[PDB]
Design a protein around this motif. Structure first.
Motif, PDB file in Angstrom:
ATOM      1  N   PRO A  89       0.833  -1.213   0.000  1.00 36.55           N
ATOM      2  CA  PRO A  89       0.000   0.000   0.000  1.00 36.55           C
ATOM      3  C   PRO A  89       0.861   1.254   0.000  1.00 36.55           C
ATOM      4  CG  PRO A  89      -0.998  -1.667   1.403  1.00 36.55           C
ATOM      5  CD  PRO A  89       0.330  -2.239   0.941  1.00 36.55           C
ATOM      6  N   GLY A  90       0.515   2.204  -0.871  1.00 33.99           N
ATOM      7  CA  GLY A  90       1.309   3.402  -1.046  1.00 33.99           C
ATOM      8  C   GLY A  90       2.189   3.366  -2.273  1.00 33.99           C
ATOM      9  N   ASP A  91       2.366   2.186  -2.864  1.00 33.82           N
ATOM     10  CA  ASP A  91       3.035   2.027  -4.145  1.00 33.82           C
ATOM     11  C   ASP A  91       2.109   2.406  -5.305  1.00 33.82           C
ATOM     12  OD1 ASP A  91       5.340   0.998  -2.804  1.00 33.82           O
ATOM     13  OD2 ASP A  91       4.933  -1.056  -3.448  1.00 33.82           O
ATOM     14  N   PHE A  92       2.715   2.596  -6.474  1.00 39.37           N
ATOM     15  CA  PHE A  92       2.010   2.820  -7.729  1.00 39.37           C
ATOM     16  C   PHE A  92       2.479   1.792  -8.749  1.00 39.37           C
ATOM     17  CE2 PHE A  92       2.971   6.612  -5.399  1.00 39.37           C
ATOM     18  CZ  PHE A  92       1.732   7.155  -5.164  1.00 39.37           C
ATOM     19  N   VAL A  93       1.640   1.523  -9.748  1.00 37.67           N
ATOM     20  CA  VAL A  93       1.979   0.581 -10.813  1.00 37.67           C
ATOM     21  C   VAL A  93       1.654   1.225 -12.158  1.00 37.67           C
ATOM     22  CG1 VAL A  93       1.733  -1.777 -11.695  1.00 37.67           C
ATOM     23  CG2 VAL A  93       1.336  -1.266  -9.234  1.00 37.67           C
ATOM     24  N   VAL A  94       2.669   1.397 -13.003  1.00 36.71           N
ATOM     25  CA  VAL A  94       2.442   1.750 -14.403  1.00 36.71           C
ATOM     26  C   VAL A  94       2.176   0.432 -15.134  1.00 36.71           C
ATOM     27  CG1 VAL A  94       3.358   2.939 -16.439  1.00 36.71           C
ATOM     28  CG2 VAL A  94       3.891   3.753 -14.155  1.00 36.71           C
ATOM     29  N   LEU A  95       0.908   0.123 -15.343  1.00 39.45           N
ATOM     30  CA  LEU A  95       0.500  -1.179 -15.872  1.00 39.45           C
ATOM     31  C   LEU A  95       0.978  -1.375 -17.309  1.00 39.45           C
ATOM     32  CD1 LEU A  95      -3.148  -1.184 -14.413  1.00 39.45           C
ATOM     33  CD2 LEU A  95      -1.236  -2.686 -13.690  1.00 39.45           C
ATOM     34  N   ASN A  96       1.341  -2.615 -17.656  1.00 36.76           N
ATOM     35  CA  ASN A  96       1.505  -2.946 -19.065  1.00 36.76           C
ATOM     36  C   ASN A  96       0.643  -4.122 -19.524  1.00 36.76           C
ATOM     37  OD1 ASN A  96       3.174  -4.842 -17.668  1.00 36.76           O
ATOM     38  ND2 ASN A  96       4.502  -5.096 -19.453  1.00 36.76           N
ATOM     39  N   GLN A  97      -0.093  -4.787 -18.636  1.00 37.28           N
ATOM     40  CA  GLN A  97      -0.869  -5.954 -19.056  1.00 37.28           C
ATOM     41  C   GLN A  97      -2.167  -6.051 -18.259  1.00 37.28           C
ATOM     42  OE1 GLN A  97      -0.832  -8.116 -21.379  1.00 37.28           O
ATOM     43  NE2 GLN A  97       0.992  -7.333 -22.408  1.00 37.28           N
ATOM     44  N   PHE A  98      -3.125  -6.837 -18.775  1.00 31.71           N
ATOM     45  CA  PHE A  98      -4.309  -7.132 -17.980  1.00 31.71           C
ATOM     46  C   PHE A  98      -4.924  -8.468 -18.372  1.00 31.71           C
ATOM     47  CE2 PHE A  98      -6.312  -4.648 -21.495  1.00 31.71           C
ATOM     48  CZ  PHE A  98      -7.324  -5.507 -21.882  1.00 31.71           C
ATOM     49  N   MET A  99      -5.713  -8.981 -17.436  1.00 33.47           N
ATOM     50  CA  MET A  99      -6.621 -10.092 -17.669  1.00 33.47           C
ATOM     51  C   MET A  99      -8.029  -9.620 -17.336  1.00 33.47           C
ATOM     52  SD  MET A  99      -8.177 -12.890 -16.293  1.00 33.47           S
ATOM     53  CE  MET A  99      -7.272 -13.606 -14.963  1.00 33.47           C
ATOM     54  N   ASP A 100      -8.940  -9.767 -18.295  1.00 38.18           N
ATOM     55  CA  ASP A 100     -10.278  -9.198 -18.207  1.00 38.18           C
ATOM     56  C   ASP A 100     -11.247 -10.203 -17.579  1.00 38.18           C
ATOM     57  OD1 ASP A 100     -12.666  -7.734 -18.659  1.00 38.18           O
ATOM     58  OD2 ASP A 100     -12.542  -7.920 -20.841  1.00 38.18           O
TER      59      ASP A 100
END
Ligand code: ADE
Ligand code: ADE
Lengths: 283, 287, 291
Positions: A89-100
């Motif tokens: 908690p308190g981190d950030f994520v620059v996402l590159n992938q997902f599962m829908d």
């Protein structure tokens, strides 16, 4: 020129704007302003008073309204739960992938019903974000002296919190309920990094619209695979969100400047040509 | 004071759990329940029964009005819901004729109304994000398990017992369900993937029933019946399983009535309020 | 009554197939609405046959909006006993190469929002509750006819259960395989593709489900031949799937698919189906839980 939509002192507010779209009204009015000389528009995903749940957000209207206003880019934020020990908690994520895992949402602008654009659009989604725009979010974090953790080139014991994770995968669940422990562990075993409710179909529709989209997710909890005292609930999410939103604002405003400092002609043309080449009814 | 609602699944389409004192033919703000609700008593504990699929079993899983069934029971003052479900096994030690007092699930349903709250005009206003880490009422789960002990049914708890204490038929003290949308059964490919995920049984009706019961501030627990020339033996086995579940339900109602639930019920209601995202934003003057 | 009649549902690359000379063109309706297009009736040899394009004449109907119920019911109403179906797909496994075909025997369903049953409690469906077994969801006799038809047309057949990997010679027809059916219209992410591959699935497509399910509900023998047009997106960026990749490979493979389908229709016509058709109908009646 570029213009950056943001879906969620150093921002000069000009005014508020109500728009309509072929797909209905957006979640709220839009705040128009400037970051330096770059035009910027801010749209609250869940509306005034956060009364619209993730499954009922009009993603099509929100993305199309930004397109109609001339946006070339969309930067997005969301809260999320961590599925993995090093995203805290308190981190950030620059996402590159997902599962829908969403359903029942309007997830494309095109089809055969009257309320959709005529045509069949099959977009490639292998790497579903704009990579240049992802790297601008990461560079903005560096410029604001926020630690960046790249699990490809670093490892645990090099991870300094709070940090921006330079990559990560999200499972998007439909909501409104949070996951069971059984579901949390299954998603973790699939190797997913975070869980959220709003990334999809927002990311998909941005690509259909010819827009460069990147998401930075705010880790607010460990979902519910850890100890009972760490199981997610609304109060826990909100308490951490309130502490992290100032950093996320600094990143987003720095990224708007960095976008405006580069030329995007070829990327924009590439975005638009990707849409054209994905028309199955035309090809 | 307690009042126990009972949602009877397959094998309980016309339940005869008690002498009918009255019937309530009602609708809800979310449409019609599956059938008339039947009122009576187990001992001096007030009870309400309704068949999930209606009499005649005409309503398939994805068309059941889970919202209306839960709302109608809440409207009558139920504090608890006990539910049954007939299920298929995904693991070697869950054998036809066994039961499972579920404690976990994986949701593969879609297209069903799964919440009372939202921004539509006919929804309750507000945004509700309920925790579901352990999605049943644990006190009520343990009642169902104790009722089985009290009716002389084997109980197997894999956390504390070796597989040699797994004597059939038995109530499995814990277990996870994958809830598929139906109406079709799973392919072999799907079954093996669910098994590899560690899920214990497959059914079609747990979700969103369990979720809506928690939204309604009710204590919910489910008992699953594992149901699978052999068809005639399977059917007779299922009849015997239904007789056993009938015994468990009647004993569980008496056991619920024997205790005080004031604090548990208050906690059920407080959990709903603490899950209102729109109200918690306001309590801190957010945005 | 022992009369056989073979419906054919044509996917991408089959928007207007010339399998036979048209005898009749049927614009029909069903209790579930209009099928994707008019139905073309004719004969392959002495075998009556009916052809329907899944996406309509101009490929304007996306996978999630196809009226599978109307398509299957229209074929049943014209007297079809069998449905043979084609689909373009992406490969999730190294031995399934673009240009190969797969006679599917399994699937994993990731579709949603589609009408997937003829039966229910609402006025717009047939009255009843139908719970169909689907453990082996295709008609096995009809699967083996597709595989024999490929042998009869001198197309390599690779059966992983009985042949060594060295006997996988491309292009070939794989004698078994599992499909994950996604809802579309977008293709998968790399994350989703690797998850599907890790579950052991062989191919990914958008149109198999609920078509295969409704065929069985209708008491029809259904089998699918999938055309591998791409490696989805788990390999190199130069092999990531897109519409042009799908169409370009399909144009190359459609010729052999046509030969398989026409030979399969003849092979169905050469056998008696009385007991299999009876069993198809009996499986529907025994799956009724309201009765
Ligand atoms: N654990 C969680 N699951 C889903 N959405 C979330 N948003 C914040 N935390 C979340
Ligand atoms: N990779 C793929 N995914 C889904 N449908 C497809 N049709 C052809 N290739 C496909």
């Amino acid at each position: 020129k570029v213009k950056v939509g943001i879906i969620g002192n150093l921002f000069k507010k000009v005014g508020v704007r109500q728009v309509t779209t072929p797909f209905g009204k957006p979640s709220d009015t839009l705040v128009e302003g400037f970051v330096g000389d770059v035009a910027c528009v801010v749209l609250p995903r869940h509306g005034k008073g956060h009364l619209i749940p993730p499954s009922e957000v009009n993603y099509r209207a929100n993305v199309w309204a930004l397109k109609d206003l001339g946006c070339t880019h969309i930067l997005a934020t969301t809260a999320c739960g961590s599925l993995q020990e090093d995203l805290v908690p308190g981190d950030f994520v620059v996402l590159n992938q997902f599962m829908d895992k969403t359903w029942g949402r309007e997830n494309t602008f095109y089809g055969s019903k009257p309320d959709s654009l005529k045509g069949v659009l099959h977009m490639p989604m292998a790497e579903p974000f704009c990579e240049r725009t992802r790297q601008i979010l990461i560079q903005a974090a560096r410029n604001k002296s926020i630690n960046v953790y790249d699990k490809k080139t670093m490892d645990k014991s090099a991870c300094i919190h709070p940090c921006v994770h330079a990559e990560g995968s999200a499972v998007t669940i439909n909501g409104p309920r949070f996951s069971t422990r059984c579901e949390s562990f299954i998603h973790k075993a699939m190797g997913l990094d975070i869980v959220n409710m709003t990334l999809v179909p927002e990311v998909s529709l941005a690509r259909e619209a010819g827009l460069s989209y990147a998401s930075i997710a705010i880790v607010t909890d460990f979902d519910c695979w850890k100890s009972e005292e760490e199981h997610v609930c609304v109060d826990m999410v909100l308490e951490q969100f309130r502490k992290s939103v100032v950093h996320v604002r600094e990143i987003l405003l720095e990224a708007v400047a960095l976008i405006g400092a580069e030329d995007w002609t070829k990327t924009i043309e590439a975005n638009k040509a990707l849409v054209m080449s994905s028309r199955q009814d035309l090809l």
